[PDB]
Nucleic acid binder design. Structure first.
Ligand SMILES: [Mg+2]
Ligand SMILES: [Mg+2]
Length: 678
DNA sequence: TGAGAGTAGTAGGTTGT
DNA sequence: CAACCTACTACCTCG
């Protein structure tokens, strides 16, 4: 085509074709007593399956097995929703399954994965955790070690053969007491675990007290409490460590050092990247080895044809290579702006170099700049808000806050406090110093995006002149479904919309349509017309007919559309057969899905290609991939590294994250071109 | 709070039928 | 139940 071909390996491997015994599994009818309700029937079968033993999986309103009935537990009980059901399994012969059919293919894949897990459990001496296995020591030191292995998957192809997915992975384990850990000049860890069970404890203050002299409620002492439960049989008790429950907040419980064990994270190791060549090596090694342990034959690595998409041409006022360059060359679109400085460290006026850099920039862009300084501290209560309102009145559009590093709660409180008065903010943290150029340049880009300037845009010719991303965020049992967009054939404007509260991940049909409509209306305000075609991007999978209503409404306005499910995980891995690993690789797969490797640099380790599904619409793939790839480059708030996600989705995820953090109630007075969440 | 991917560690929560 | 989203923490860099 227009774009240049090459060939790649996937981290997938073809094994045997399925013989007929594997194609004619035992079928079983499940009889529950009493009968289950409609929502509970489906998971209870899964429950009956584990209790059934052997190698059995859910099938329809019944069971499928690769084990003969004689070694299953056909009669039993299973307690679930506080009701004890008696199950009886009734065998109904074997029956042929057809591999071309995605439903039965789903069952054969389930049966295969169960087969795999059971075959791994009987391996020795290797360490099994579900579908991940760890084989050798990658590292080790005084009291700790890192195991290495792979995460595995097994399923069945549309042509009825086994398929192996392999991806190297690491495990960190410690198996050392807290006392001994400290007794070798390590510092105190973040997290710790009971030596006698799984309970974690957030560690805190090691303590000066004594046990066999500390008093627990019940007349007993720490020492004799733990002694009583006999835990001081193997171990010896320690100093007196203090722990706070992980759910509980800052309540302190006592605890011997001799009975705690540190839990280690990455933070605690002062590789695991694996430059891609090594990962590819290891993947082939582990794959072939697994093939050998299993009665599945010789593993053959899967190849796919790949194409390199043209490199997008990024623009400020003139040609650019990174968004930080717009600081020197000028923005795509400049407007008359005013910015404020808030010093929370007890310092005085504007840092000089910042003033020089921005002034130079707005000079290049040919727009006028006015700089203000806010004289008030938030500790002044309501007068602080008064000063904020006064500032907004004087024309101020965004705020820079120079402060020592803030605790999250205080950070959120301040940000929000400015937001209710329509002031997006950029925090920058003192010390700073001019020679730390990247940090303060990225903060500066953030500031400009938050006052609504468009620092960069594209130069290509793309199929859709409006692109919109959708995601749900927030962590309090409810979420925020939100949308963000890039407007114009040039992506010349960036906008967000107010999210909506929802029960979970599924965005209601009418909500989808309303957010979409707001972006259409925005396009109407800029271009003076409706878009010929829009590109609709959903983060993660698109749930059944979630877009149906929005889609129909679009068809009704005479607007053409494309729906793309963009999945951040599950897309596996891609390694070139002989060249360099390059950015911007398009890899078509089955009929409507394809991979897209958008971001990569060598000092990061092996990339994680995105997986994309064209759920609806009739624009050709290649062009979809082309536009999405180019859109990954639009993000204005990262000066030196493009995000993996295309600009609308990266914005959407950051939007719902921020609304999920602060609240939605502050946004009533904040303009939609101002990206307060970056 | 500079922010980016890719890592593993913890703790969450949700969709399917 | 089963498989798979979100959110946070280092780190080293700076298309
Ligand atoms: Mg997200
Ligand atoms: Mg930010």
């Amino acid at each position: 085509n227009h774009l240049g071909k090459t060939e790649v390996f996937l981290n997938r491997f073809a094994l045997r074709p399925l013989n007929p015994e594997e194609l004619r599994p035992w079928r079983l009818e499940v009889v529950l007593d009493p009968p289950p309700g409609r929502e509970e029937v489906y998971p209870l079968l899964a429950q009956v399956a584990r209790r059934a033993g052997g190698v059995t999986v859910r099938m329809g309103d019944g069971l499928a097995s690769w084990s003969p009935p004689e070694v299953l537990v056909l009669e039993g009980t299973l307690a679930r929703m506080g009701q004890t059901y008696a199950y009886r399994l009734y065998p109904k012969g074997r029956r042929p399954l057809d591999p071309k059919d995605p439903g039965e293919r789903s069952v054969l894949s389930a049966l295969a994965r169960r087969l795999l897990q059971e075959r791994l459990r009987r391996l020795e001496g290797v360490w099994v955790e579900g579908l991940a296995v760890y084989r050798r020591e990658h590292a080790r030191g005084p009291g700790w070690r890192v195991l290495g292995g792979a995460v595995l998957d097994l399923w069945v192809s549309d042509s009825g053969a086994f398929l192996l997915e392999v991806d190297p992975a690491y495990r960190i384990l410690c198996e050392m007491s807290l006392e001994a850990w400290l007794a070798q000049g390590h510092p105190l860890p973040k997290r710790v675990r009971n030596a006698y069970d799984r309970r974690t404890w957030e560690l805190l203050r090691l303590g000066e007290e004594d046990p066999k002299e500390l008093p627990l409620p019940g007349g007993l002492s720490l020492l004799d409490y733990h002694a009583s439960k006999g835990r001081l049989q193997g171990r010896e008790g320690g100093r007196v460590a203090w722990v706070a429950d992980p759910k509980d907040p800052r309540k302190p419980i006592p605890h011997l050092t001799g009975l705690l064990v540190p839990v280690l994270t990455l933070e605690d190791l002062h590789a695991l990247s694996l430059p891609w060549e090594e990962r590819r090596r290891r993947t082939r090694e582990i794959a072939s080895w697994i093939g050998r342990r299993l009665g599945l034959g010789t593993p053959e690595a899967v190849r796919a044809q790949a194409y390199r998409l043209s490199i997008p041409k990024l623009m400020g006022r003139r040609a650019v290579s990174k968004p930080a360059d717009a600081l020197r060359v000028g923005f795509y679109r400049a407007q008359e702006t005013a910015l404020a400085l808030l010093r929370l460290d007890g310092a005085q006026g504007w840092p000089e170099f910042l003033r020089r850099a921005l002034l130079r920039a707005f000079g290049a862009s040919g727009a006028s700049l006015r700089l203000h300084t806010l004289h008030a501290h938030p500790s002044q209560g309501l007068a602080f808000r008064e000063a904020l309102r006064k500032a907004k009145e004087e024309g101020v559009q965004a705020v820079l806050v120079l402060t020592p590093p803030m605790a999250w709660e205080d950070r959120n409180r301040l940000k929000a406090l400015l937001l209710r008065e329509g002031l997006p903010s950029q925090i920058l943290n003192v010390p700073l110093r001019e020679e730390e150029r990247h940090r303060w340049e990225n903060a500066l880009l953030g500031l400009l995006a938050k006052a609504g300037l468009q620092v960069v845009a594209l130069s290509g010719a793309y199929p859709a002149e409006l692109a919109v991303g959708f995601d749900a965020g927030g962590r309090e049992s409810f979420r925020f479904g939100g949308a963000a967009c890039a407007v114009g054939g040039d992506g010349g404007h960036l906008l967000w919309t107010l999210p909506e509260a929802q029960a979970g991940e599924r965005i209601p049909q009418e909500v989808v349509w309303d957010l979409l409509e707001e972006t259409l209306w925005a396009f109407r305000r800029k271009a003076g017309r409706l878009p010929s075609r829009v590109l609709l991007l959903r983060d993660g999978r698109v749930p059944q007919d979630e877009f149906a209503l929005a889609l129909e409404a679009l068809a009704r306005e005479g607007i053409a559309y494309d729906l793309v499910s963009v999945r951040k995980s599950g897309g596996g891995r891609v390694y070139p057969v002989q060249g360099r690993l390059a950015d911007g690789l398009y890899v078509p797969l089955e009929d409507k899905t394809f991979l897209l490797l958008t971001v990569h640099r060598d000092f990061r380790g092996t990339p994680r290609p995105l997986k994309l599904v064209h759920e609806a619409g009739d624009t050709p793939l290649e062009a979809l991939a082309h536009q999405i790839f180019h859109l990954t480059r639009l993000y204005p708030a990262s000066g030196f590294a493009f995000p993996r996600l295309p600009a609308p989705l990266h914005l959407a995820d950051r939007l719902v994250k921020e609304v999920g953090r602060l609240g939605i109630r502050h946004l009533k007075e904040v303009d939609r071109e101002k990206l307060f969440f970056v």
